Amino acid sequence: MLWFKNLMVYRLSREISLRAEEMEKQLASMAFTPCGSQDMAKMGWVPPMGSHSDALTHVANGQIVICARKEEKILPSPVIKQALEAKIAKLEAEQARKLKKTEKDSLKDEVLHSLLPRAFSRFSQTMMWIDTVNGLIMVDCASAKKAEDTLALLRKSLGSLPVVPLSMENPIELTLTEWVRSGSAAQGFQLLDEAELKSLLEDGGVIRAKKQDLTSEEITNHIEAGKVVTKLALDWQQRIQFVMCDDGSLKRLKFCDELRDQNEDIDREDFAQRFDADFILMTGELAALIQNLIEGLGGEAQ
Amino acid sequence: LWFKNLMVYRLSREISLRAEEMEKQLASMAFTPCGSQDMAKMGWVPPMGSHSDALTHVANGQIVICARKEEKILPSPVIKQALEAKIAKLEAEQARKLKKTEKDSLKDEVLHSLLPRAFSRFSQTMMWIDTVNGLIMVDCASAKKAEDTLALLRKSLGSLPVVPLSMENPIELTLTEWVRSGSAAQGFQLLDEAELKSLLEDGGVIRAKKQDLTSEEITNHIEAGKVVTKLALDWQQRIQFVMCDDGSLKRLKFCDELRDQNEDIDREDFAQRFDADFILMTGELAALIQNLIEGLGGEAQ
Ligand SMILES: [Ca+2]
Ligand SMILES: [Ca+2]
């Protein structure tokens, strides 16, 4: 399998009509289909398991994983910009004076209808894990908008999907700054070597530190002047490193060799059982990180 | 028009063609576009654009030339998928057979199929030759790209023997000193941006922005043994830029005064604003370059 690289977490508002044999059925109708030559972008469900399965969901232990594929046309803004000018300059190559607003909404779409068919595609695929035990959904993506596009896709397949982001009692920057300031992260977590420190004032001073000793007074000074820690590298139990972000997100997930290789003795042949072992392993482990991290950051606002 | 970055290079010998002879050797290597099947194409274009059909503009021993590059927007995955898809059709009846010269003559057909569909990416690169000082300045942020444009000119001219400025003293150490001492060399004043790197292979990088660099938080990094490998500077309240320890100047901001000092009774006529703005920019950045070899120690061996 492919492990999460990044994480946006959501609380699902106290259950879904999740009958997984009708879940599969609802996702089936939004399975992925490729773009027609006038489509910009399509999106839809694919097998979390690959060519190796036809199933749109995988379930193991009240954990569901689902996969969203996106196809986007490679049509750069400078390419369209020139096509248009070339033709807007060609009227005028026989009597100048251009004009005007809803004129080159018609001209602009000739170029789009014209260029669109030849445009190549770019592919993206986002995995999404739903923990029915914790009532939480984890999206393997680096941006809020990408996680919101998959959630909307999901909520369209299923009708309603009331999620919110996790919101903490204490602000994150302020819990992060005190871990650095006191020289120790909350129980479970340890401080690595990478941080972002911002002044409280737009325009007052941003410090990005890498491969640096954080509990050192070089860093201390920054906090002591008014800066707050807005991104902190963390290691949980010798087993999972990540950047904690002040917006509640986890960037650049790294799983230790020992979890990655844990199931090395599975034939290298049955992909369905390798995915099965790896999935139960990843989700129990991220689940237990999340529970501990909520608590290290001082608890959810209730 | 105005440079955004700057790489500097000493021209080891006198040029000693003549600019109507240069003009003519650059006419021969003039840009023409990509054919449906070409992939990429590079050559020289009027630095002045539409307003002139000449490939060189000259003023006061200051020549400027301009390279244009075009490359097909054709990703290696799109290639890959179209090839693999096609092999996965000669899986009708097997004979895996010549995945050496059948898959081989296959790429050519994918390429030939896809190249005409592919859209184009364009870049231009201004190149300014200071015959007086024997320097060449390329408006580019990467050394790859400056070496591409010199290559073009060394093909157009036969020979271009060039070297990057080499400082007697490493630039980091001078940068560091100015941040330790609280002050840049005369003509320059420290701005609010710096990268600080430790000497050990394994040590921190500090990137600061919108930061006051004459303060304990910065200089403590220096006491801790970090060197300033990039420092933001203002030359004479006219030009801001970032000095790098590889020797290059990034993110040139010319003060409004200069941008506007030819604003007045120049209207429709582009050709005059160009010469005027060009004379002005060259002579101004010629000063900075001189004032900054001095500021920085000096050159050479
Ligand atoms: Ca320490
Ligand atoms: Ca100060």
From Swiss-Prot, chain B:
Keywords: Cytoplasm, DNA recombination
Domain of life: Bacteria
Any one Pfam family match given in the protein's UniProt record, by short name: RdgC
Compartments where found: Cytoplasm, Nucleoid
Record-level GO BP terms: DNA recombination; regulation of DNA recombination
Disruption phenotype: A double deletion with priB is disadvantageous to cells, which accumulate DNA double-strand breaks.
Gene Ontology molecular function, alphabetical: double-stranded DNA binding; single-stranded DNA binding
One GO location term (cellular component): bacterial nucleoid
Main location: cytoplasm
Family note: Belongs to the RdgC family.
Annotated function: May be involved in recombination. Genetic interactions among priB, dam, lexA, nagC, polA, rdgB, rdgB, rep and uup link the PriA-PriB replication restart pathway to DNA double-strand break repair.
Name the record gives this protein: Recombination-associated protein RdgC
Organism: Escherichia coli (strain K12)
Lineage: Bacteria, Pseudomonadati, Pseudomonadota, Gammaproteobacteria, Enterobacterales
Gene: rdgC
